[PDB]
Amino acid sequence: MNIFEMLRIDEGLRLKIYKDTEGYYTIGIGHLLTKSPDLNAAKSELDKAIGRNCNGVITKDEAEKLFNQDVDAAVRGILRNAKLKPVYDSLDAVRRCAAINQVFQMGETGVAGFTNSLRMLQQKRWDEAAVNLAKSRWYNQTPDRAKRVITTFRTGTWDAY
Ligand SMILES: [Cl-]
Ligand SMILES: [Cl-]
């Protein structure tokens, strides 16, 4: 198990434009296209991302390429973020996967909000962190997935997957 296998399980694979859990146009393995309610806006973003006129449909290969780019982007984002980088670097490899999973789903606009959780993670107070992480809109809106990620932070094992 690794971040690709983990996110494949959490995000699924869909080859035509669909709406994610927040109602946003998405494709492939959790590739967010746009927050716009206009489907034409999403189709444009898709063509731009893939570099051809897709008409809302892609291949598995294209889906895996976007997935690779998106994972790479999530990691680089963490490493460029002065708040996230020291916590990330303090973690073991399995817990680093949980961290990338979060950023992949949430982006990093929630950094200030998860300040207390992040401190507990860097302190390696795993049970306290896990309890704190569940006190979130994130947990309440996607509890099954959040439970899997939190368990991964708590244990440093792949037991939830
Ligand atoms: Cl792209
Ligand atoms: Cl708490």
Side-chain angles (χ1 to χ4, degrees):
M1 210 88 61
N2 55 59
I3 183 59
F4 293 97
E5 299 289 352
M6 187 196 207
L7 276 170
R8 199 163 281 119
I9 283 171
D10 285 337
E11 300 285 358
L13 170 59
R14 303 186 76 177
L15 295 185
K16 63 195 58 182
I17 290 181
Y18 67 99
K19 290 185 181 180
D20 70 8
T21 65
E22 299 280 303
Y24 297 141
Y25 291 121
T26 303
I27 196 161
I29 305 160
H31 182 84
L32 176 63
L33 288 168
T34 180
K35 292 193 186 170
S36 167
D38 194 347
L39 176 58
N40 286 331
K43 291 182 165 189
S44 282
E45 288 300 308
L46 177 59
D47 296 346
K48 175 164 62 89
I50 300 301
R52 75 178 174 83
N53 306 116
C54 295
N55 194 29
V57 178
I58 60 174
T59 65
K60 188 158 186 165
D61 277 21
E62 292 171 341
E64 292 289 346
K65 187 178 190 166
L66 287 178
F67 186 32
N68 198 258
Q69 292 180 171
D70 290 348
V71 171
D72 192 83
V75 179
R76 304 306 293 280
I78 287 165
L79 296 180
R80 295 189 339 254
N81 188 293
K83 308 303 283 290
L84 297 182
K85 182 174 162 50
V87 183
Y88 186 76
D89 281 353
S90 76
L91 299 171
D92 60 280
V94 176
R95 295 191 172 88
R96 281 181 185 161
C97 289
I100 299 162
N101 196 308
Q102 289 189 312
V103 170
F104 189 98
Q105 177 185 7
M106 257 178 282
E108 61 178 65
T109 185
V111 166
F114 278 82
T115 301
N116 302 317
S117 281
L118 290 165
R119 182 167 46 248
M120 296 178 193
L121 288 174
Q122 195 174 353
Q123 292 176 311
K124 302 193 176 303
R125 308 179 174 213
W126 306 127
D127 287 22
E128 291 163 271
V131 172
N132 189 265
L133 286 166
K135 295 178 172 168
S136 59
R137 179 182 190 277
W138 171 57
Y139 180 81
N140 282 282
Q141 298 301 130
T142 49
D144 287 346
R145 193 228 183 117
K147 276 176 200 169
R148 284 194 292 276
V149 175
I150 291 176
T151 286
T152 307
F153 275 127
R154 185 177 53 88
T155 68
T157 76
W158 292 110
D159 297 330
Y161 287 87

